[model samples]
Target chain A: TKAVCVLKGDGPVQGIINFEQSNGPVKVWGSIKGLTEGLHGFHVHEFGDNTAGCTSAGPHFNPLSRKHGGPKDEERHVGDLRNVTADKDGVADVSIEDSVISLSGDHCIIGRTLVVHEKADDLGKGGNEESTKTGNAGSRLACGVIGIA
Target chain B: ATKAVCVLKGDGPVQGIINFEQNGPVKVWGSIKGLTEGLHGFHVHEFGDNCTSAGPHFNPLSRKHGGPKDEERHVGDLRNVTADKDGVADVSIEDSVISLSGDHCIIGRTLVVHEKADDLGKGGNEESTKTGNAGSRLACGVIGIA
Candidate 1:
């Protein structure tokens, strides 16, 4: 099975991300716009809900109850997949793989929200408390939900 | 003191919630899912009779159908709502012509979400008068006080 999310809003941020099943890890692929020319925080969030804007999507999907870290970290949130870099034209093309992503079961990422933030994820390098849990990423710019596709 | 809601009706996966807040002018916001993507016709109708039974637009003023910004139009002429590629529509509008309290209070009225985009009265067709000819009714709900 596979899950997909179509980013929304008034800005140029548009595109669809598809997360599909894999023996090793889930495959993620999509291209987005409306981001600045630099690294921006991108991650899966807690809820698929979009009721009160993206903020209503809640926190990260940290299933293991672990702190936040990069996609490659041994001890990190399943959602800590890393940063998405945009070019001068405010566009980001993403293609990544992660074992923590699941298309089914309790650990599944389906029905959760994906967000693109205003700041680059610090990758938990802030040398402080909140950084370990959230990467110090700033406000959300765009968001969407993962649904069966 | 001012509040209302509507649950969209349909056998399809498309579901919606209409929330009304009583400001000086009535404020309406809705978040809907399971649309085809892009614009859909949205308006309040006159009955709560059930699936496809809600009847025509809620026209207490007996006026013509028009956009939200139009001066002389039906009280239920909310015009349109936009949905993203994922079929998600999160829209908010303020309507000065309708109310949640007295003569124009819409509690018990019906709200309609149509299948196609409305031409906002500019579409020169015979059906544009009785309605905007906004296609079939996809979902409907009752305006309830909350």
Candidate 2:
């Protein structure tokens, strides 16, 4: 019924994302702290050998093999969750539903890696090639592995 | 993990499993078959007396009736469930306020399915504060520990 991802990093940007199975799809909702006031790209990266840090987690979790776009865009990769905006106190509380992840099965985010980025994801709106992939989302700041609940 | 095996009391068969995971923001999900097709009022009722008039909402804190997001309301105020044309109701819900263990533990309670929609406490009537005026019970079962 649930899965959790405990974020880890030097920044105070730490939190837990709860994954639940909903009608036809999965629902993701959580509160993240220690982020700046603005946007931060959020996504589920690969289940990499994370002993090295964020990059060790490999590419984004894109089991469906699609182009990158916003969270609502049809062509967007399953991993393209887009951006999360923090409040004036550097807190971001959000809830969203998507077909990209699940509590179990092939698209399940359980045991995968979740990454928070330095800049806002353009959601492939930047019109560049890599933007089509990463939405040109900048460097990673924090990450954690998704765990079963 | 706690699972509730629900037996639809007339068409009468234990036809569903509502498994509650033991962590985070409190989530309830599972699938149930055997029902007429449409939106059904699904909620955790107050008492478990063999499913007959299972009392009001399980508002232990003594609050008014409301939706899944209301603050001063019952701990068992879950959203409604919908059945497909094939008579299967798939359910899921998330509420940080409810608990699977401790004070909000729903184990040994009654889970009821109603004949109408929950007005979300906004029906502007008497039963609205009592149980969302969500009509009479259609089927019922106990939420036992699993």
Best by DockQ: 1
Q: Which stretches of model 2 miss by more than 4 angstroms?
A: B1-146
- Please, what are the lDDT tens digits per residue for candidate 2 over residues A98-147? 77666555675654577888889988889678888887778888876554
State the lDDT of candidate 1 residue by residue for B12-103, as single tens digits. Answer: 77788888888388889978889888789998776544446566777877888887788866788886889899998997988887787667
| Count of steric clashes across candidates, in order | 1, 0
Give the alpha carbon lDDT tens digit for every residue of B1-146 in model 2.
Answer: 54333333433542565655554676677777776677777777665433454576776788888888787568888887888889788888776766656677554356677767778888889788877877767776544333
Q: List CA RMSD, all candidates.
A: 13.8, 17.6
Off by over 4 Å in 1: B1-146
In terms of lDDT, the poorest run of 10 residues in model 2 chain A is A46-55
Query: What residue pairs are clashing in model 2?
Result: none
lDDT of 1 at A72: 86
The DockQ scores of all candidates, in the order shown, are 0.04, 0.01
Structural similarity to truth (TM-score) of each candidate: 0.55, 0.49
Model 1: per-residue lDDT, tens digit, A43-139? Answer: 8987655555577777888888988888888888877777988889988999988888787665666656788888988888787998997798898
Query: How far off is residue A60 in model 2, in Å?
Result: 1.2
